Curated annotation (Swiss-Prot):
DNA damage-induced activation of ABL1 requires the function of ATM and Ser-213 phosphorylation. Polyubiquitinated. Polyubiquitination of ABL1 leads to degradation. This is Tyrosine-protein kinase ABL1. The gene is ABL1. It is found in: Cytoplasm, Cytoskeleton; Nucleus; Mitochondrion. It is linked to Leukemia, chronic myeloid: A clonal myeloproliferative disorder of a pluripotent stem cell with a specific cytogenetic abnormality, the Philadelphia chromosome (Ph), involving myeloid, erythroid, megakaryocytic, B-lymphoid, and sometimes T-lymphoid cells, but not marrow fibroblasts. A chromosomal aberration involving ABL1 has been found in patients with chronic myeloid leukemia. Translocation t(9;22)(q34;q11) with BCR. The translocation produces a BCR-ABL found also in acute myeloid leukemia (AML) and acute lymphoblastic leukemia (ALL).
């Protein structure tokens, strides 16, 4: 913590970024380096939660997870300083891309990177709880990094039970979570599949036109999204594997990763 600790004067805010809360495009003066800074203002997030988030992130070290650069946690306002990803989020990136550049191989590459980060989180006993395209970031040369959020500590064989009155992103949310507010790394696997669908559709919204009130009812009757146009059958089977009712029957991120890596190497 003292090694990550920084003076707020080391950073100059440049631009405000707004669906994420209080996140700014800042400049780390010393290195003339563009950075991203999360600020705590108006008690939008509780202090102790904000601090734990910063304490957790400094344990994270993976090429596909947004890297912590430093923190300002002595005098309010409190800062979290992370690396800046040039091209924004994966959802808007995919929607606005040149699909001749961002082709099938690049889609494969994007999934391999994400599954890599979640394989890491799987091994280090963490869960994400909001895996989606909007929460993935894109750098140069089709580099993708999963947002360090927002991570909770949880042993692989345990279950996080969410607070009461908690509202989830229903179309990304596993059945066990929708019904009993239970979360697992296997529920993150579910979300990955929905993310996997967003990639193949280049950013289309999931379960199109389907009402959120009738999603869980559809899921328990074994309804799943159809294979997108152009999607390899091998990819849809992984999607389907991620979308199985019993989380025990859902593949591990380690297994998912090897699958996509093999598909990526073989292309
Ligand atoms: C993980 C640490 S943190 O969770 O504690 O703080 C957060 C929280 C959320 C973040 O964005 C996902 C980040 C972030 C880190 N690095 C980043 N680089 C770039 C951008 C970004 C730039 N421009 C446009 C967009 C965009 O597409 N918009 C719709 C705005 C996004 C955001 C970030 C950091």
């Amino acid at each position: 913590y003292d090694k990550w600790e920084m003076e707020r004067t080391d950073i100059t805010m440049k631009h405000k970024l707004g669906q994420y809360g209080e996140v700014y495009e800042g400049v780390w003066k010393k290195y003339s380096l563009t950075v991203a800074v999360k600020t705590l203002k108006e008690d939008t997030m509780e202090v102790e939660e904000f601090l734990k988030e910063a304490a957790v992130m400094k344990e994270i070290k993976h090429p596909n997870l947004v890297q912590l650069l430093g923190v300002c946690t002595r005098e309010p306002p409190f800062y979290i300083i992370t690396e800046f990803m040039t091209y924004g989020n994966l959802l808007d990136y995919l929607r606005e891309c040149n699909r001749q550049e961002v082709n099938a191989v690049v889609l494969l590459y994007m999934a391999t990177q994400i599954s890599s980060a979640m394989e890491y989180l799987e091994k280090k006993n963490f869960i994400h709880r909001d895996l989606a395209a909007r929460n993935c970031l894109v750098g140069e040369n089709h580099l993708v990094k999963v947002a360090d959020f927002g991570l909770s500590r949880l042993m692989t064989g345990d279950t996080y039970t969410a607070h009461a009155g908690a509202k989830f992103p229903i179309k990304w949310t596993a059945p066990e979570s929708l019904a009993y507010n239970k979360f697992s790394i296997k529920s993150d696997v579910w979300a990955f599949g929905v993310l996997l669908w967003e990639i193949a559709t280049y950013g289309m919204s999931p379960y199109p036109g389907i009402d959120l009130s009738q999603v869980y009812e559809l899921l328990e009757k074994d309804y799943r999204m159809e294979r997108p146009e152009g999607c390899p059958e091998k990819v849809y089977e992984l999607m389907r594997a991620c979308w199985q009712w019993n989380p025990s029957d859902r593949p591990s991120f380690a297994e998912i990763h090897q699958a996509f890596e093999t598909m990526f190497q073989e292309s």
